[PDB]
Amino acid sequence: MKVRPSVKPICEKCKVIRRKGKVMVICENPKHKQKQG
Amino acid sequence: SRVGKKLLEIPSDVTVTLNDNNTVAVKGPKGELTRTFHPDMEIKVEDNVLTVARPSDQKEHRALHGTTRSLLGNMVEGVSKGFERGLELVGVGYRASKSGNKLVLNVGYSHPVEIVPEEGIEIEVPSQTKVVVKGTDKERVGAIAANIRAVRSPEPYKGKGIRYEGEVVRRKEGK
Amino acid sequence: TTPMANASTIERKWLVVDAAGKTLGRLSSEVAAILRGKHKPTYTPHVDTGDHVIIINAEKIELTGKKLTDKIYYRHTQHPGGLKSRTALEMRTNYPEKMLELAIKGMLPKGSLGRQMFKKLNVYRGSEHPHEAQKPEVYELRG
Amino acid sequence: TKGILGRKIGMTQVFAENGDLIPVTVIEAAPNVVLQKKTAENDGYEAIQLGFDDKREKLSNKPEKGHVAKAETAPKRFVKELRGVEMDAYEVGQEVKVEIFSAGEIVDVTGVSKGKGFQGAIKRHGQSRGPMSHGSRYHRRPGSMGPVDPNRVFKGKLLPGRMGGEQITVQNLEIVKVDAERNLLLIKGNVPGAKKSLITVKSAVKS
RNA sequence: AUAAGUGCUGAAAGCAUCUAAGCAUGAAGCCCCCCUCAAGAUGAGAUUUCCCAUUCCGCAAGGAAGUAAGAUCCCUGAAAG
RNA sequence: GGCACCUCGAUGUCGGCUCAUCGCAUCCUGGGGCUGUAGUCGGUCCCAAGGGUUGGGCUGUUCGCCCAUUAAAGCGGUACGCGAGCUGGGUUCAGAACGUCGUGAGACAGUUCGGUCCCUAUCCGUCGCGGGCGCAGGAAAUUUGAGAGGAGCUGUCCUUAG
Ligand SMILES: [K+]
Ligand SMILES: [K+]
Ligand SMILES: [K+]
Ligand SMILES: [K+]
Ligand SMILES: [K+]
């Protein structure tokens, strides 16, 4: 996980979503997994 | 909701009964499934075609419409054809064995892991390296398959573990 | 010239309020008013002019928003770090009578008379109450 | 749950078959009797009330006479409930005897701990002394009453007072030996309270 | 029962998606379980057993007086202080 | 540090002792994601404050370094918590001395040796222990548990298995 104020697509296959009112990236690359915090 | 609006053909062998409070019971050759839906949705059955209707184009309704349609479709498919989920044990000495109704997994722990299936779910072990979870309810088939996968989820260094059939496990190089 | 109610003049009816499907606050504000006796023209500030209230179906009280999970009933035990908490959900399931009582208690006056007014509240989990002898009338919430 | 009441005779010791030396306590328990059976109907919980120890008819009163009348026994000096017991395996009047227990059986054992009277925060609260030397005028006082900020002492500042005479339960003691011609148990270890003091033995809660 | 986390099924958004509806799992932590106190819990709870409806004024209200069951004073003491 | 708002008809000041309590920005232990994670070890971030979190040498010290441990040797707040609880080594009275400055008396965040720490607890608070009345008759026992307190740590070895 990256938990960070700035959450963004790193690659092209990054996909910003929203779960539980929290901005997350998801991406086949598990490095790129983001949550916003 | 393209999904919601799509029309659901009921096969001749499946009877859908609409009960009070939007409770749909779906009966077919493989058994019966009962489920309550949200009141706002309008589920019609005309000439062996199930259609779902949303009261308004509010965010919630557009979402509910597609969901309801999808769930009813899964119920009809479930009682007719059934759902199966297939698992592949990858590993030296990794073996599944059915003991009565219990699935027993030997996956490199110091003890065997027993899984008891819930009602309506059959686990088959066609080979020592393959497990097939069968059932009517797509959710429950999925849940049990995930539970079995959880015992030893696939690792990236040699792909060892329990995987779904046709799962692309990401691989990293060790030494 | 202004008349004043006193123990000799006051006469208290018994009212049953069904809490089923009612908003916690909105029920509680009304009940508190009846307990104080704000609905009677003989209302006198320095005496308890109000009516008894039975609440039934306290377990079926409703909360809007995410208040079931998020509304927390704190309490302190007056020992250091003695702060306990229960969620509204936990209150409603296990302590429904306490939940209503707490809500109403906070809406009454606070001194000796206000404590006295609270004694006429009787709250119950299920549909039945044991106060058949008091011959309680139904009271619909004005809303 | 099995239970019985008893008096603490006092300790002694017992070689085991292996030859190991076992310290025991000697709980004389001349048969307990059942006096009441509480139920979920009546009392709102299921229990049995045991009586122990024949009281003299001088030392009794009409309310103690009256209460034992159903069981049909003499007034009992000690009366203690047991909850959790299997209700249908007793009857009011039934005697409860040490042979309910077995050797090697685990037990919990209650008593009232031996009283000390008023005690210092050293003994009472196992607190450290101050220095005894080095110009110290602080030997056995109980420490600082706490921070300034609150302008009050924090409830649970531990202080000298009356010590001992608490209900205490020790757990998971062995029954070493049962004697029913004497009405004794032998219990590996040391249980709360004086000699003659009332000891309750139960089956252990954590088995 | 939850946290982080992992999900299942699943649309909004023909796909995907742990979430919107719905359904799981999951911490030495939370609530219990264990130990102790506890009805001044004035919201003063419950159960068992005992005593039993006395004599006076006073129009009654009420007050006074002997007692019942029971307890105490005083006394012998300690396992208590 | 700045400011000079309370206290100069007095709010005792460092360190230690005794007694703790709180925060979490977590030192250990519990649960996780990512890893330039093979394993054993680690790194980093997330949840988690329940409990735990050492004995010495030197120095008035705090701090720090060192020795030996430990699962760990957390960081902070509480009048840099705690002197009507203790100490009084240091700082900060009067003596004396060194270096230094000063014509001098003297002086020095320079040093050195020596140098009085008062108080019978009224109230609240804390810890124990009684007496009173209450609890719609008077009693003797046994109780339910609203509620409150306590406890909460962790090593090593063997086996699984070389
Ligand atoms: K001053
Ligand atoms: K200060
Ligand atoms: K002092
Ligand atoms: K002071
Ligand atoms: K005061």
Coordinates of C-alpha atoms in Angstrom, one line a residue, chain C residues 2-110:
Chain C
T2 CA -52.1 34.3 38.4
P3 CA -53.3 30.8 39.5
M4 CA -50.7 28.3 40.6
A5 CA -50.9 24.5 40.5
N6 CA -49.9 22.6 43.6
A7 CA -50.1 19.0 44.8
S8 CA -53.8 19.4 45.8
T9 CA -54.9 20.7 42.4
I10 CA -52.7 18.5 40.1
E11 CA -54.1 15.4 38.4
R12 CA -51.8 13.2 36.2
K13 CA -53.0 11.1 33.3
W14 CA -51.1 8.0 32.0
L15 CA -50.1 8.0 28.3
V16 CA -48.7 5.2 26.2
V17 CA -46.3 6.2 23.5
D18 CA -45.3 3.7 20.9
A19 CA -41.6 4.2 20.0
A20 CA -41.7 1.9 17.0
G21 CA -40.3 3.6 13.9
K22 CA -39.9 6.9 15.7
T23 CA -36.8 9.1 15.5
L24 CA -34.9 9.0 18.8
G25 CA -34.6 12.8 19.3
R26 CA -38.1 13.7 17.9
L27 CA -39.9 11.2 20.2
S28 CA -37.8 12.3 23.1
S29 CA -38.4 16.1 22.8
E30 CA -42.2 15.5 22.8
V31 CA -42.2 13.0 25.7
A32 CA -40.0 15.4 27.7
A33 CA -42.6 18.1 27.1
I34 CA -45.5 15.9 28.4
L35 CA -43.4 14.8 31.5
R36 CA -42.9 18.5 32.3
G37 CA -46.6 19.2 31.7
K38 CA -46.1 21.9 29.0
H39 CA -49.2 20.7 27.2
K40 CA -51.5 21.6 30.2
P41 CA -52.8 25.2 30.8
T42 CA -52.3 24.8 34.5
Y43 CA -48.5 24.4 33.9
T44 CA -46.8 25.9 36.8
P45 CA -42.9 26.1 36.7
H46 CA -42.2 25.2 40.4
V47 CA -44.4 22.1 40.6
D48 CA -44.5 18.9 38.6
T49 CA -47.8 19.3 36.6
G50 CA -47.0 16.7 33.9
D51 CA -48.4 13.3 33.0
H52 CA -46.9 9.8 33.3
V53 CA -45.5 8.4 30.1
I54 CA -45.0 4.7 29.3
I55 CA -42.8 4.1 26.3
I56 CA -43.1 0.7 24.6
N57 CA -41.2 -0.7 21.7
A58 CA -38.0 1.1 22.8
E59 CA -35.9 -1.4 20.9
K60 CA -37.6 -0.3 17.6
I61 CA -36.5 3.4 17.9
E62 CA -34.9 4.8 14.8
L63 CA -31.8 6.9 14.0
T64 CA -31.0 8.7 10.8
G65 CA -27.6 9.0 9.1
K66 CA -24.9 6.7 10.4
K67 CA -25.9 7.3 13.9
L68 CA -26.4 3.6 14.7
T69 CA -22.6 3.0 14.2
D70 CA -21.2 6.5 14.8
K71 CA -23.2 7.9 17.8
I72 CA -21.3 6.9 20.9
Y73 CA -22.6 7.0 24.4
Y74 CA -19.6 7.9 26.5
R75 CA -19.4 7.5 30.2
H76 CA -16.6 8.0 32.8
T77 CA -16.1 5.9 36.0
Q78 CA -14.3 8.7 37.8
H79 CA -11.1 6.5 37.9
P80 CA -8.2 7.7 35.7
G81 CA -8.6 6.5 32.1
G82 CA -12.1 5.3 33.1
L83 CA -13.8 6.4 29.9
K84 CA -16.1 3.7 28.6
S85 CA -18.1 3.9 25.4
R86 CA -21.1 2.2 23.8
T87 CA -22.4 2.7 20.2
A88 CA -26.0 3.5 19.6
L89 CA -26.4 0.1 17.9
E90 CA -25.0 -1.5 21.1
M91 CA -27.3 0.6 23.2
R92 CA -30.4 -0.2 21.1
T93 CA -29.8 -3.9 21.1
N94 CA -28.8 -4.4 24.7
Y95 CA -29.9 -1.3 26.6
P96 CA -32.9 0.2 24.7
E97 CA -34.6 1.5 27.9
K98 CA -31.4 3.2 28.9
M99 CA -31.1 4.8 25.4
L100 CA -34.5 6.5 25.6
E101 CA -34.1 7.3 29.3
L102 CA -30.7 9.0 28.5
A103 CA -32.2 11.0 25.6
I104 CA -35.2 12.2 27.6
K105 CA -33.2 12.8 30.8
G106 CA -31.0 15.2 28.8
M107 CA -34.1 17.1 27.7
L108 CA -35.6 17.6 31.1
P109 CA -34.7 20.3 33.6
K110 CA -31.7 19.3 35.8

